Amino acid sequence: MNVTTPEVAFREYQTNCLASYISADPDITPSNLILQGYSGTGKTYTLKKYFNANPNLHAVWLEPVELVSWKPLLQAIARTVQYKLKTLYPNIPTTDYDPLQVEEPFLLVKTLHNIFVQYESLQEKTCLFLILDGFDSLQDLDAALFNKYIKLNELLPKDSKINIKFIYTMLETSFLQRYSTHCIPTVMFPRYNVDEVSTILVMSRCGELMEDSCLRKRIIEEQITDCTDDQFQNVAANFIHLIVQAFHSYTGNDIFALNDLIDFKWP
Amino acid sequence: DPGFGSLQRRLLQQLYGTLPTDEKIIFTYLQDCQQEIDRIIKQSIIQKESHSVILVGPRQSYKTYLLDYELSLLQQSYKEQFITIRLNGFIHSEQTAINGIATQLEQQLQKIHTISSGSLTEVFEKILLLLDSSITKITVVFIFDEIDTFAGPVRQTLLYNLFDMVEHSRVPVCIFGCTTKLNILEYLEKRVKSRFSQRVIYMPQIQNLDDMVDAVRNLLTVRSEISPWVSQWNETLEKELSDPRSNLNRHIRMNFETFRSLPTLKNSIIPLVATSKNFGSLCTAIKSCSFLDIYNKNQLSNNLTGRLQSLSDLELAILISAARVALRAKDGSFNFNLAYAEYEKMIKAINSRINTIKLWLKKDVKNVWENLVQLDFFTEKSAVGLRDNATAAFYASNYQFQGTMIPFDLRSYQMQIILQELRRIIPKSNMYYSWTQL
Amino acid sequence: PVIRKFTKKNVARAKKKYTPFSKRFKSIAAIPDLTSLPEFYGNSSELMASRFENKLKTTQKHQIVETIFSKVKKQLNSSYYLPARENEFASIYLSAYSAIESDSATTIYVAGTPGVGKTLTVREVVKELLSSSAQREIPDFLYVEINGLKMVKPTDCYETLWNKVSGERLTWAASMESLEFYFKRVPKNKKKTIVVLLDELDAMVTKSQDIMYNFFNWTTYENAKLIVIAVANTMDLPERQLGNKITSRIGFTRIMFTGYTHEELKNIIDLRLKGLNDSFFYVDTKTGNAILIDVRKVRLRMSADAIEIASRKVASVSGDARRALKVCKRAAEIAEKHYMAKHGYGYDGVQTVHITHVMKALNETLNSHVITFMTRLSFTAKLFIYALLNLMKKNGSQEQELGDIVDEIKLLIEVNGSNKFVMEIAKTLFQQGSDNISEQLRIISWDFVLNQLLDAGILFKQTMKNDRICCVKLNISVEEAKRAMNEDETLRNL
């Protein structure tokens, strides 16, 4: 298209589909998109790395885990959309609508209809991506809430200049199979291998294990000053390969359990 | 070249349906349905009759697609003749659909040329005596998505009054209800069925394999000369559909036998086209269709086989051990204590007949036990996971369940994948394969 | 200010007063003559109700074609003298003529199954005795429509009745004290008789039954001049809600409207066709526009046996006049679209509505579509039903465990491995066609077709998060599920 695909390490299929659905042109972008994977499978990593490599298409990052109910989730959508567009188009005169005034799924649609009509002087069709990052992690979740966000595109005006686009992130694949007949595109993030966890964990943590003071302090204080960075990197890399090969059978293909057993056992 | 970059962009926006509304693709198997919808809208907008009708078909059956097509084609000829109201049974309630009509009434009437302000008993009596009551009238067209939630068992006030405008109002009121339920007339009350005009039209279904071939032929043929590659694309795609043993016509046949839905194949073709760098790779990728095997592998890569293949050796051994306790039990139930007892007598019987395999302790399998819970291999015993609506999810959050309060190793669990299924997926070369059978 | 624990930022409160009518004249002798008073009885409200006709007006009109069958569908509408309710007209009119002429108060209760002409003929009663009152043989009265399903709240009938009586906007707890002081305390010389129609009285009394008592108790008063025509559906709604001693104290009349016979449906349908049946139109052959008395003199007769079988079938089921006027309206547009397709007029010797147009209009509302839906599903969706029907004849338990269905689908492809269709599909149903995808536990599109049958209403599934022990019913029948699966060629042989 007219988009840039970043090089994420073990997600090269997932990034090509992520560049396939997300674009600046609103006619060739789906209004719903699910990125399903389990925990630690690198789906907020490559979602973030895709938008950083593409700065001219716009994103609103929401976390539905720190919003707990459905009603703060609607209010944060109304707050962060109009706060995004004020930084994004300062030359447009606008009147701020109170985001705490939405108390209904329809009052979101009426508020988004009022926000979007005053940016009607824009030059071309523009899509703003509303990233609900962890929609399944909402605590009060029920079956009838995700099909309430699928259908917001049909209630908002079709010839607006700002076309909101929903990108969902979810975990558990029994939540996803309830909405299989909606036929909305989904990119799956499967669990990593043992060789994929080790390569990711060694490029993520060898930087911090040098700037850690404990390895830093000891080598000058033990009076063995015969080392280089290439030994410094290889002594921390071989610890990570050794902390995985001992505790892979305990943790599994996690990233966050390996990251805790490193820093508990690196000092 | 920019010709290929313009050959992708039309061919991909034909796959989303965002062509302008004289070039929009109408498949031949739903022409007799869209002509029936076409007749209803333009003898209610042109000829000012007031009849109502319910559209019914499955999800992704072009109900909203054909209504958005018919209004957009009447948009360009008769713009001044009608306002359009659309509600939706998901985001609207019995209380909120009253505010949704009055808000859309007053903002559609500004574009051709207050109602929405006040109490809810005020805002409902103002939209009644607006609607219930050579110059001609404005026809008001209503669109309902999921009319079956408005047809609940309790009161059905909003469907009563709108069907009462079809019969008695002097304003021409067209009402579409898009539902999925086949027995939609049995949700309606005796008064509400009596007002309704009994016309319930059923969305057509794909009957033949050649219906999906012709409908993919209509989706992937470019009918104008935009790129230098248009004729070269069109003669390639007609060779790929005329050959019955082609790979593209093989992936259409699998869709016809399993899903039989063209929007599911539509999501497969979209990154086959968008992830093609040049025309040499875009012409190759529809001949081979090697992406659609990679696509179908992804969609189904962590369902339940792809999670079982992503387990370590202790995680697999505890999953087998809990699957043997669940097979001996009469209720299919087990604890952490029962599944570690079967685990430790398994590692003994491996090391006795045989270098050695580590037996992990009671405190260390606890982390493995909790990961199999959160990967949906174990469920809580008689568990109700997600509730239907918002009030049942609220009632459950105020109740304090028993399995929360009993200790960790005493919770009864049940089993997502049984042992007879667990023998068939694990390969015959695993050391744990002999323990997938009693 | 203070820090609020929650916010209500969408409160819209009505400008309705709180003090009732019993506290604004200080004396019964200081109440003026309410009939010769400007804001009572709707003497100024005729300006705002006619405001909204101008909102739906537009000036464009380009020669819409009015064909032969468009005139028949205009005349079979329910909004367009009534033959088959004559003894019921003469019962409601006699009971209301006597109470208005004697300055009395009464209640008339009328019930029946939906669509039998009772909202129509009560409005025809009060239109006859408006014309009798306008000739001054009974005194003047005021007429109030109250519809229970045209209210948001059930308590809005108190607000709307007192607004029509007095022109005052009060809350409901202030409106019922205003009405109760109005009917028992205000003298009969100062008031006007009021004929209120409590339409669809079922809907007002569902929660607290405090509303049916008040309207009926107000009619027992001596000073009250109130006639409550209470139209509902069932006949025992007074005695169930109020009780036996209350409904004997009120002493209201009690009419039931039986649904119409088939001969009464014929004298409704053919009564609305006296100006058009056996009549001549002027149809030009280039636009299609008909004009009642380049152009042929065509005429229009509708077949009498077509109205016969439309009356025999509708009256045998429910007996309502709506379903018979819209089975003849539906037949009139089936005949139009074939007239519109033969000559191709579009939109801008003799025509008839046959027996086959009325049967086609009548068959489509009586057929079910769960047969036609399930014969045209996937092989996967039909394999789900065919495995569910085998389980309901191994057990007859009629709600099957969903893991028993999965093992049956696998066993049914297991056993029939010699079959020509099953050898070529089992590769495309466990690995989904090619290699590099492993052999799997569920068939391809198992989550799609299980959700497709739950969305369609064919299939009921209980709420369990264990996807294997969950139970699954049908919702249609075991017979019409087997009828749809013995039609499909590949499943009935295996």
Add this chain to the structure above:
Amino acid sequence: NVRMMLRRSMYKLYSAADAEEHNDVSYDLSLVENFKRLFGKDLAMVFNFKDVDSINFNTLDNFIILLKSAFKYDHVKISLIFNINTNLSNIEKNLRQSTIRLLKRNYHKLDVSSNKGF
């Protein structure tokens, strides 16, 4: 449940920050990110769980995981205080294992009793 722990915690900090200040806010964990953008000073919130042997540990586990999402805001620090009346060994059998690995980056056991050392 978990939303009642948060709506009381976000009410108790918004009420106690207007008391020291001398518009309305949705009471959720988006008040923690807007705290410097609305009050000008950074935050240090302290949680004091009173009868943690009487609370259920499904809710307290899901609330510590909820508070874990406030470590991306660069101007807040949370401090938990557990009034464990009985035992630490009873608590670590109740919480999930990935929560104990979060509670162990810095913890401090303080024996608090009238009966200690007599």
